[PDB]
Design an enzyme around this catalytic site. Structure first.
Site, PDB file in Angstrom:
ATOM      1  N   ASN A 170      -4.684  -6.817 -10.114  1.00  0.00           N
ATOM      2  CA  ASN A 170      -3.419  -7.452 -10.014  1.00  0.00           C
ATOM      3  C   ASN A 170      -3.705  -9.211 -10.768  1.00  0.00           C
ATOM      4  O   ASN A 170      -2.965  -8.940 -11.667  1.00  0.00           O
ATOM      5  CB  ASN A 170      -2.916  -7.608  -8.399  1.00  0.00           C
ATOM      6  CG  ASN A 170      -2.460  -6.088  -7.937  1.00  0.00           C
ATOM      7  OD1 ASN A 170      -2.525  -4.735  -8.582  1.00  0.00           O
ATOM      8  ND2 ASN A 170      -2.488  -6.349  -6.115  1.00  0.00           N
ATOM      9  N   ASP A 209      -8.802  -0.921  -8.602  1.00  0.00           N
ATOM     10  CA  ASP A 209      -7.920  -1.847  -6.606  1.00  0.00           C
ATOM     11  C   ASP A 209      -7.624  -3.677  -6.708  1.00  0.00           C
ATOM     12  O   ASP A 209      -6.873  -3.619  -5.893  1.00  0.00           O
ATOM     13  CB  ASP A 209      -8.554  -1.316  -5.466  1.00  0.00           C
ATOM     14  CG  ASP A 209      -7.897  -1.155  -4.736  1.00  0.00           C
ATOM     15  OD1 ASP A 209      -6.843  -0.803  -4.705  1.00  0.00           O
ATOM     16  OD2 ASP A 209      -8.129  -1.014  -3.523  1.00  0.00           O
ATOM     17  N   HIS A 263       0.743  -1.605  -0.066  1.00  0.00           N
ATOM     18  CA  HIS A 263      -0.010   0.077  -0.060  1.00  0.00           C
ATOM     19  C   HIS A 263       0.672   1.658  -0.159  1.00  0.00           C
ATOM     20  O   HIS A 263       0.928   2.429   0.932  1.00  0.00           O
ATOM     21  CB  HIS A 263      -1.167  -0.314   1.223  1.00  0.00           C
ATOM     22  CG  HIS A 263      -2.444  -1.315   0.873  1.00  0.00           C
ATOM     23  ND1 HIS A 263      -1.868  -2.193   1.786  1.00  0.00           N
ATOM     24  CD2 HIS A 263      -3.054  -1.349  -0.228  1.00  0.00           C
ATOM     25  CE1 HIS A 263      -3.394  -3.106   1.522  1.00  0.00           C
ATOM     26  NE2 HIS A 263      -3.900  -2.380   0.156  1.00  0.00           N
ATOM     27  N   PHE A 314      -8.901 -15.974  -3.091  1.00  0.00           N
ATOM     28  CA  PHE A 314      -9.188 -14.412  -3.451  1.00  0.00           C
ATOM     29  C   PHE A 314     -10.241 -14.119  -4.855  1.00  0.00           C
ATOM     30  O   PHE A 314     -10.519 -13.528  -5.175  1.00  0.00           O
ATOM     31  CB  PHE A 314      -7.621 -13.854  -3.592  1.00  0.00           C
ATOM     32  CG  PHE A 314      -7.743 -12.372  -3.597  1.00  0.00           C
ATOM     33  CD1 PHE A 314      -8.262 -11.582  -3.018  1.00  0.00           C
ATOM     34  CD2 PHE A 314      -6.561 -11.891  -4.917  1.00  0.00           C
ATOM     35  CE1 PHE A 314      -8.564 -10.215  -3.207  1.00  0.00           C
ATOM     36  CE2 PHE A 314      -6.899 -10.450  -4.667  1.00  0.00           C
ATOM     37  CZ  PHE A 314      -8.168  -9.285  -4.188  1.00  0.00           C
ATOM     38  N   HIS A 335      -6.467   6.782  -3.507  1.00  0.00           N
ATOM     39  CA  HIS A 335      -6.975   6.552  -2.606  1.00  0.00           C
ATOM     40  C   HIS A 335      -6.297   5.834  -1.489  1.00  0.00           C
ATOM     41  O   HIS A 335      -7.242   4.786  -0.363  1.00  0.00           O
ATOM     42  CB  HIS A 335      -8.632   4.994  -3.767  1.00  0.00           C
ATOM     43  CG  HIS A 335      -6.756   3.795  -3.534  1.00  0.00           C
ATOM     44  ND1 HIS A 335      -5.731   3.903  -4.626  1.00  0.00           N
ATOM     45  CD2 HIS A 335      -7.201   2.988  -3.023  1.00  0.00           C
ATOM     46  CE1 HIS A 335      -5.419   3.555  -4.309  1.00  0.00           C
ATOM     47  NE2 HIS A 335      -6.476   1.856  -3.613  1.00  0.00           N
TER      48      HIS A 335
END
Ligand SMILES: COc1ccc(C2=NN(C3CCCCCC3)C(=O)[C@@H]3CC=CC[C@H]23)cc1C#CC(N)=O
Ligand SMILES: [Mg+2]
Ligand SMILES: [Zn+2]
EC number: 3.1.4.53
Length: 331
Positions: free
Chosen positions: A241, A238, A80, A292, A120
């Protein structure tokens, strides 16, 4: 050395030629820019979309604010950080030019989506909301335990406009500012994963009822729908990936795992319950990534891909190939 670029800036510039493509070499840009991926990618985008003329943003003010914003992402945080910000910006930038959204959004909506992507995660400490809550941190006290990080990200992103020569919105009317701001807040607050299911539920509902006049572009005729799409868009960025070429994806997985394990280590050494995925001694990175993808990223992107059919097919294909790759490496 007065006039033309150095050889390193020329190499940066040639990398920046991929700014409109999925899977930009963002880590290489971070290296080449002297760890200024967010500043350079934001500046390139702003130029490309002609946002400096449209919103009368002086260039020195934009650079100053960008550098300032970038300086408030933590270099000691593995995921992050400013490189992640830059990737979500560039990823939102690609999503905005999808053929199914041609001429849908105003310059102000485009600005809001890009600016929101940029801020963000600013000042992210590399631990979760729950960690901030369970430790009794000041940030959790200030935000009454609700979307602590995301509220903080917004507040910092806007606060920094007040530093010397940083108010990039100085020439917008009040009306433009109020609308920009409301959009940016709505977008960033929707990046909290606790909102994911509701956001996804509403995006499905929109894909069921989707209309499409004139060209083939979506019809979004009210704020509630326009903002939803923008929120899901930045949320997809976001969560982008696993949709990137594998060499990129793995770098992101390495980084998120380092950050999560760091938190788990802090949690252990303090005698706290270890948060899911944060325990380096009981990890399966491969299973975790497959889960995920199956529980979170694939359902979102498959729905995004329906909204903008067929523009996201290669992105979905890459996601499914990455998922197989990880599934095949499972012990
Ligand atoms: C490339 O990998 C990853 C990239 C991102 C994330 C993220 N997870 N969540 C949460 C974590 C708790 C479970 C609930 C759903 C996901 C976040 O709140 C993060 C902050 C904002 C959005 C998504 C982020 C996780 C992984 C992973 C993994 C792995 N365990 O292998
Ligand atoms: Mg976040
Ligand atoms: Zn993020």
């Amino acid at each position: 050395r007065f006039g033309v670029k150095t050889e390193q800036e020329d190499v940066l510039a040639k990398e920046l030629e991929d700014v409109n493509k999925w899977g930009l070499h963002v880590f290489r840009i971070a290296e080449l820019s002297g760890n200024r991926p967010l500043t350079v990618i934001m500046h390139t985008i702003f130029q490309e979309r002609d946002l400096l003329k449209t919103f009368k943003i002086p260039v020195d003010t934009l650079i100053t604010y960008l550098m300032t914003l970038e300086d408030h992402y933590h270099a000691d945080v593995a995921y992050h950080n400013n490189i992640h910000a830059a990737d979500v910006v560039q990823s939102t930038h690609v999503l905005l030019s999808t053929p199914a959204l041609e001429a849908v959004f105003t310059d102000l909506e485009i600005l809001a989506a890009i600016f929101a992507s940029a801020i963000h995660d600013v000042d992210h400490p590399g631990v979760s909301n729950q960690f901030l809550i369970n430790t009794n941190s000041e940030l959790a006290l200030m935000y009454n335990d609700s979307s602590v990080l995301e509220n903080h990200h917004l507040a910092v992103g806007f606060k920094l406009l007040q530093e010397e020569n940083c108010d990039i919105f100085q020439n917008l009317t009040k009306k433009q500012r109020q609308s920009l701001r409301k959009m940016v807040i709505d977008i960033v607050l929707a990046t909290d994963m606790s909102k994911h299911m509701n956001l996804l539920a509403d995006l499905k509902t929109m894909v069921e009822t989707k209309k499409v006049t004139s060209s083939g572009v979506l019809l979004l005729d009210n704020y509630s729908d326009r903002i939803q799409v923008l929120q899901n868009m930045v949320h997809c960025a976001d969560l982008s990936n696993p949709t990137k070429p594998l060499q990129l994806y793995r770098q992101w997985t390495d980084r998120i795992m380092e950050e999560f394990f760091r938190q788990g280590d802090r949690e252990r050494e303090r005698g706290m319950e270890i948060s899911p995925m944060c325990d380096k001694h009981n990890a399966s990175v491969e299973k975790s990534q497959v889960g995920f993808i199956d529980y979170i990223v694939h359902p979102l992107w498959e729905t995004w891909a329906d909204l903008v059919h067929p523009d996201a097919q290669d992105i979905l294909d890459t996601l499914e190939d990455n998922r197989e790759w990880y599934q095949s490496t499972i012990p």
